[PDB]
Write a protein that binds this ligand. Sequence first.
Ligand SMILES: N#CC1(NC(=O)[C@@H]2Cc3ccc(c(Cl)c3)OC/C=C/COc3ccccc3C(=O)N2)CC1
Length: 215
Amino acid sequence: APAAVDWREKGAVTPVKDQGQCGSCWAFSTIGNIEGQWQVAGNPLVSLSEQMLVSCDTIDFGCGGGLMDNAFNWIVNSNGGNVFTEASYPYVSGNGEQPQCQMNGHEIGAAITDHVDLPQDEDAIAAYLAENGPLAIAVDATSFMDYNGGILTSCTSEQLDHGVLLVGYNDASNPPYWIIKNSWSNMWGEDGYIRIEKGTNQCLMNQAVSSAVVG
Ligand SMILES: N#CC1(NC(=O)[C@@H]2Cc3ccc(c(Cl)c3)OC/C=C/COc3ccccc3C(=O)N2)CC1
């Protein structure tokens, strides 16, 4: 793969969001992925709606939790592949309140046809990322809690508990690192982002990597 990829610079990554007091990281990971895949497939970058998943996805458990694979499954099999725009269906569950699913009054911003699950292989991940755009990944986010900045090189890697967005990497660095977009606002980490070492399966980052398919 290329020595370095940063999908932010290429316009496939929206501003950092904030899930708030709701267990919806799974929806933010899924949407960030679809946002990146939709742009890189050749369409204008558009912000898409986590609230659609929080309120309408019947496979997952709204603010109680969920899985990116199940979110992809719901979008394709229950919503005809369609993803509503962030603007037309704003995120209101940041206080943990969960309105009922609202199917009316929105604009469709993107569409997906399937999803893939990537092998548990950092090189396989980097190539698919470099080709297709940002990727949905799960991490053990234990070491995320005290992170101010820098590259994590001894990330607690015991148990997966948090969905994030993989937007890039940089091998021409010492250590080399992945770039991750978190959903804890831009006042956490490196303006919303975190760097973790690439090649040592930091935070169990290789274990559950997925992506929507566009087109
Ligand atoms: N934010 C947030 C919260 N965490 C999640 O939504 C995680 C977010 C999450 C955690 C771990 C993950 C993934 Cl892919 C997501 O990968 C391994 C999967 C473990 C089992 O995850 C679940 C399976 C079924 C239903 C929910 C989960 C789950 O625990 N999802 C606390 C609710």
